[PDB]
Amino acid sequence: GEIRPTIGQQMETGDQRFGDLVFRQLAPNVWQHTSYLDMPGFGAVASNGLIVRDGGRVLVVDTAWTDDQTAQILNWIKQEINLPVALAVVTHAHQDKMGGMDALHAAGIATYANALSNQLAPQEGMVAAQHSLTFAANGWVEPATAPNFGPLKVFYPGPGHTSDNITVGIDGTDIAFGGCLIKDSKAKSLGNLGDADTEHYAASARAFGAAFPKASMIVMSHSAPDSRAAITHTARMADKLR
Numbered sequence: 283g284e285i286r287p288t289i290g291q292q293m294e295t296g297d298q299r300f301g302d303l304v305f306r307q308l309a310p311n312v313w314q315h316t317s318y319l320d321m322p323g324f325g326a327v328a329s330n331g332l333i334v335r336d337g338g339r340v341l342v343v344d345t346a347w348t349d350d351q352t353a354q355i356l357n358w359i360k361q362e363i364n365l366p367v368a369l370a371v372v373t374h375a376h377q378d379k380m381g382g383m384d385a386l387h388a389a390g391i392a393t394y395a396n397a398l399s400n401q402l403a404p405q406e407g408m409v410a411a412q413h414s415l416t417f418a419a420n421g422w423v424e425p426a427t428a429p430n431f432g433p434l435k436v437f438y439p440g441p442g443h444t445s446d447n448i449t450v451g452i453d454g455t456d457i458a459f460g461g462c463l464i465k466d467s468k469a470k471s472l473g474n475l476g477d478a479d480t481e482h483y484a485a486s487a488r489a490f491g492a493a494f495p496k497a498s499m500i501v502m503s504h505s506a507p508d509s510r511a512a513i514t515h516t517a518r519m520a521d522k523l524r
């Protein structure tokens with residue numbers, strides 16, 4: 283019964299299986315969602331996002347791979363937290379991060395992505411978010427484009443895994459989320475570099491670290507949460523691309 287991914291972390295102590303998904307509490311008001319894409323002849327690919335309780339509402343970072351899996355996330359939220367889901371931020375226009383947009387929209391959840399992610403979305407087979415985030419030259423989100431974001435601190439580190447990749451810190455916690463930009467401290471590969479900026483990747487990884495200097499728990503798309511060594515190692519792998 284247990285899902286054993288070909289890519290992505292395995293289930294460990296602290297993980298809750300719910301439907302086709304896995305959930306792990308990371309802090310009093312933060313959970314990691316994990317969903318799995320089954321590739322025939324290859325196996326499962328795990329992808330991770332976040333769920334944040336901020337006061338009386340829930341904020342989501344990234345969809346699951348599919349609409350149905352994303353609906354399962356909303357069902358888990360209903361059963362375990364039982365608060366309205368106010369908004370989602372999705373971290374670039376690829377299936378692991380935006381495959382479930384229709385499910386969010388059907389539920390009345392407001393969605394936000396980098397303007398560039400919304401521009402790329404149809405070209406990448408994704409439904410665009412309803413609202414566009416824009417960024418200063420230093421990478422920080424323009425505040426008026428991210429209204430009522432609670433503790434979420436949204437940072438565009440520069441082109442890396444993709445040109446549109448964004449990252450999210452959770453103020454008042456030890457957590458920062460690198461999405462697919464960051465790989466864990468023991469990874470041997472940066473994953474899919476097909477859409478990547480190999481010249482600028484290393485600087486973008488370092489910029490993420492410097493934007494969230496305090497965070498000790500680095501959450502990412504395809505590994506369990508790691509130390510800041512994930513940032514250092516990702517940057518060192520990326521140095522080799524130049």
Ligand SMILES: CC1(C)S[C@H]([C@H](NC(=O)[C@H](N)c2ccccc2)C(=O)O)N[C@H]1C(=O)O
Binds near residue numbers: 289378462472503
């Ligand atoms: C885990 C991945 C190697 S695949 C994923 C993403 N790819 C997709 O979402 C594709 N739709 C896909 C196609 C076939 C099999 C799995 C995923 C990407 O290209 O960044 N993120 C990659 C990554 O984070 O390095």
Ligand SMILES: [Zn+2]
Binds near residue numbers: 375376443444462
């Ligand atoms: Zn991607």
Ligand SMILES: [Zn+2]
Binds near residue numbers: 378462503
């Ligand atoms: Zn990915």
